[model samples]
Target chain A: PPSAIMETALYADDLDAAEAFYRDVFGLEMVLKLPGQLVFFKCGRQMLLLFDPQESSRADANNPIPRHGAVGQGHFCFYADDKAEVDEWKTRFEALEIPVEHYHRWPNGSYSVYIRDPAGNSVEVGEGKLWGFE
Target chain B: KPPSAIMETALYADDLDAAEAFYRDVFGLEMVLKLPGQLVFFKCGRQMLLLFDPQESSRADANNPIPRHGAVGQGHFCFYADDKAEVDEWKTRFEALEIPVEHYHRWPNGSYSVYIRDPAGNSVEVGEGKLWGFEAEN
Candidate 1:
């Protein structure tokens, strides 16, 4: 079996807006950025891809990768260390003017907070206890 | 302040059941949860893969406070292989399933990768751990 996820793609059009949103929120380091097409971020051992939906949805000779484009509101939840850290992210989003759409404490006693990216993907931060992986 | 890892990597498919089985039987991931046509969750190492029905997840209900999320078009997820030969093994497995792999190429860094689509047409990639400017870690 594959050991872990190496990369995941998030679709969006406005590279500048998406760049600013994530940069302000997570301070992720940019591994690569291809002008208006895409930006790749280094998050621990994983890479987060933000691509223009229109461009990624197509098969272009310029790019060797296969089609991987999505429309509408996709979802992605990332790691938070603990209950306190989850709340810390909520506070960070408040300063960025990104509202936590939901602050949920699961029946399992794990906490998670949600927000939307510039392209409106349902982005979240949750404790490892939510899945009992910790 | 970047996240240490992505906790839940979600993709949407109209046929939630087929997507679930594809990841299970083909990718060898363990199913951790299922909610019929609504969603299925699979254990992928430290992270989890979430398969949801776009229509079902897009609708907001008064009783459901999680808020609505969904998507159209093919989604993408990439898996890690510790070695280039492991990626070759994945391509061979795809042949056994008669699932045509759409792409096979080595990166500028000389790591290999293979791409295939799931039953719902989500692009699934198996790449050398070092392909994406990364490799396996604890």
Candidate 2:
């Protein structure tokens, strides 16, 4: 059977702006930093890694794997503990002066607050009957 | 603080049927939801993977509060394995399914992972152990 999602990554032009946005807005603690090339954040069981596309695509002789990256913004959702937490995130975003692009209520009554990271990736914080959670 | 865990992720595809089949056949993920030609959802442990038709989703949803146009090109996400052995099992399964393993890596932190491409060209990774040296607190 498939296990948990361990990591998700996004490619950005400015690693510093992406780092600042995730840290200042979402309060994600930086777990790993590769100078100006990459930044990793500890988010519950998963880690979110941000990379500079130009630097990330360069071939590294030490690593055998081929480099990978994306050209445009991606989307990912972070889970809140409960509905109250979801509401709290909204307030937190407002206090940080981040513009909420959308608020969605799924058919199952779950709620998601969407915002854009500095690199234009659609980031979400949500709670409800989602992903087999009750 | 931000939310605790990543609940879901979405990737756009030109062909939903082929993309859906690739994930189900290769990863053995449970199909949790399907909306005809528009979108499909697969269960990935406690999280979910959403695959949608970019053209369809880009159009405004009258029922939706906001319009969503998903990103282009290859998006990336990694699935965790219990150990290095499990990661090898995935490689075997991929071989059996005739899916190509694009690359593999042994990280400096003593972890390893295999990379593959979904039908839509999104990079999917299956890795073993802690990725960033932090274990999930219980």
Candidate 3:
């Protein structure tokens, strides 16, 4: 009855630091940045919205998007071309001193490399068919 | 840098099996992975919807480690509907599924969204694509 997910959000305390991890480290294009409140990144065709729980939970007349926020860490995975691409990302994180948290070769013969953003959210890059589809 | 897409997103649930059924039976989402009490992955459009048991997934499993990760409280996810007609239809669908509609919001930009809580208490939404200025155009 519904279509694709247009967006997914993660909460963070420091918007600037979150911007750096997502934009500088992970290399997503920054679309919008609201100083104390939120940062938005263009993730593929979807938008990855980040928020400050304290600020987002409060309704503001200036911006009427329904108040929503989450506590604790969140996880999302990126789709890469292949195992070699996954390895390349792992190397990128490791070279930047961002420890690659885990590497798993799925039963489907695909692979994933996990890392964490500055806000502690689990960020993963994996083969497209890891979940059984390209 | 290699270009990539977001192939998976996740939400936590207290009961993996129940949440799995909710998404499966109610929403008609196809299951891609079901790992007993630990996790369930559903095919939601082109993206994989990962439903994890927060406690189980947060453990640094000695055997199958993926790095301990999870969240507490509600997380947000949305189902995009291209038209107002399709978006409004979700309220009726929720009624037949017997879940209460928590909120119905019409945005300042003239798009609307329907909200409800899944079994795990995640805030799920069915919204018009332009609600977030996401409509396609050059």
Task: Spell out the clash pairs found in candidate 3.
Answer: none
* TM-score of predicted structure 3: 0.88
Per candidate, the number of residue pairs that clash is 0, 0, 0
Candidate 2 collision pairs: none
Best by lDDT: 1
Regions of candidate 1 where Cα sits further than 4 Å from its true position? B136-138
Q: Model 3 residue A104 lDDT?
A: 89
Across A1-134, the per-residue lDDT of candidate 1 in tens digits comes to 77788888899979899998777689888888889999988788888889898888776877788877898888888898899989889998898787779999899899999998888888999998988887
- Which predicted model would earn the best TM-score? 1
Q: By lDDT, rank the candidates, best first.
A: 1, 3, 2
lDDT of 3 at B137: 30
Error of 1 at B56 (Å): 0.4
Candidate 2 lDDT over A1-134, as tens digits, reads: 67778888877889889998888877888888998889999887788889786666677866565566666667788888777788888888899888888877777777778888888887888874655476
lDDT of 2 by residue, B36-92 (tens): 999999988788888888887677767676546566666678888876788899989
Per-residue C-alpha lDDT of model 3 across residues B40-64, encoded as one tens digit per residue = 9888777888899988888876776
Q: How far is B93's C-alpha from truth in model 2 (Å)?
A: 1.1
Q: Which ten residues in a row have the lowest lDDT in candidate 2 chain A?
A: A61-70
TM-score of candidate 2 chain A against the true chain A: 0.91
